[PDB]
Amino acid sequence: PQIRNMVEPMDPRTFVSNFNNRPILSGLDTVWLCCEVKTKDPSGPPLDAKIFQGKVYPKAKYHPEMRFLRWFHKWRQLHHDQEYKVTWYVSWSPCTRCANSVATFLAKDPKVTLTIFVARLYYFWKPDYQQALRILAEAGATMKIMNYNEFQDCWNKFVDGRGKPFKPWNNLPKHYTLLQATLGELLRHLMDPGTFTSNFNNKPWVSGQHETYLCYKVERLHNDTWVPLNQHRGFLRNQAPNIHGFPKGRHAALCFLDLIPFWKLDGQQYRVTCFTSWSPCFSCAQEMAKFISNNEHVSLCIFAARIYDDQGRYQEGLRTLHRDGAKIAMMNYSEFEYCWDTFVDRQGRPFQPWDGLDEHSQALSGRLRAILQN
Template structure:
């Protein structure tokens, strides 16, 4: 599939203008960069532009091209970074296809800079954008630096600098606020399929659909519920590790530190127990907030046979944080609060047996040393 290397100036300014209400802009332009440590791609293939071709959307054009031209020259397991600059964010269909693609290509990272967000008020559209983030994509609204980069790399600019249009930054704030609303409202709840795959406490789980990997690679989620002492509505949220970014536990701590917390109870459900660095930082947070009750329940223990990870878990326990392995009551509570309170939780095979085994391992880890007085 052929694609132009750059855009004409008029095309760029018309289609990438981040208007709050963009009439007459029915096409989507996708400017891309592909980069990797050992990437042997020829220079012309490292960047380019796709647009909608008939019924085939720009994102689909990219996926077809990537399968045909890039995957063939990448060695197995080679990390590859992809950056998109888009005039419109992906629609439902494309977002789902890209999310499925990321789920089966764990060596690929994707950053999507969007000038405008498509059908911001559509709940299905919002859910699909959040699914992209859950699969590791990073969604960002384009601001002046991104427009400059896109202009310099993907427009026939004749050496002329990018000239910002009026209200560019004001429109960015509008687009960015809409994106944050979408992510904060939707990411507070997990999809049912995501929950059953990510929180399953079996040693391995098979993917729902056949993929090139036999087993599903699970990620680190933190679901948290903060209960104020005055009987107000609990604050809930869900955070996810993202490629090349901070761990979900650190994102959780950043959010907690941004609030004035006192005498609150916080319950966290984690797909994986924290790594040593996250454990030490959680312990430090508890030391700085002795009047906070913090409970951490992990579905699975992460590298529990390594001494450094064992010491990290001990530091949590010794700091006064209640640390335990999720069992049926915790899985049920997590489902009710973060997935679907209208439907009953359906336990998977050997849930209790797996929990019992992990609880034994955690008890042995806690016996590594006495708790602090």
């Protein structure tokens, strides 16, 4: 039995119009949901597959997530009980009602695990919808943003492409990174402690890997005092090159600069701080210096674990960044501890500093000062 025999594949124009992942997208009156039900073993065809659709308004009871729940209840009565792995590709993330219904269903049934790939985040800026996605995640649903691979898979399985291959729309990768970072913020995703310790150790770097992790937070000026702005706190990393994502990669500092306009900050004074495992290369620093030159109400503070020699003009880039008003400093014990406490999935464990932390911070601080004073 093949997916083509299980579903009526949707029209290609229905798929592309409904699954376009522009984060802010008006005019869509419908939610689409493609799903597969599998055993514990993921290889081969699913046990069954279905496409559900429902109008957003006026009744959530006809949203495709609830249509799925009613179909799946009846389907299970007709098949021999076993453990099920369910995958959804949904055009909009769940509204508050569906999120709470699915969360209740998952939490009462240890035999079912659910992964939800979403094309767009629905009302991601509204606290009610944020809290509902957290309840769904806490019920064990794995919630991810649809990337190129999932759009292509959904095209192959659920669309009447007539053998033509999936063609990505404009800016699919840029949309993905904005949504991924936004989903991480609202789920309050914390960084793996091993990933933190490995990447923020400031001893001389000996690994062949060049990856950059970047933790960020935002403050607002209020009554001559900086106050936390808890909505936009999290971490991200560089995007490795891939011809279906960013063909030349996208460095962490640039992904961070992409986020700031997406936050829709008002005209008040803001201080945006990042803790990055590598200081920015020349290209990143130029872009960062351009940004702060053009956004006078945003103050940048950059704390770096290590100084990245890009074999080019990185020293001049750091000088330009400082000249244009960014604060640049090397992370000391206090900044390492703050990120462990704030951004890392530490499970109550205190910060344990690696060997030579203080000594390496002093050496790097002296190198930075020498760079900035030329």
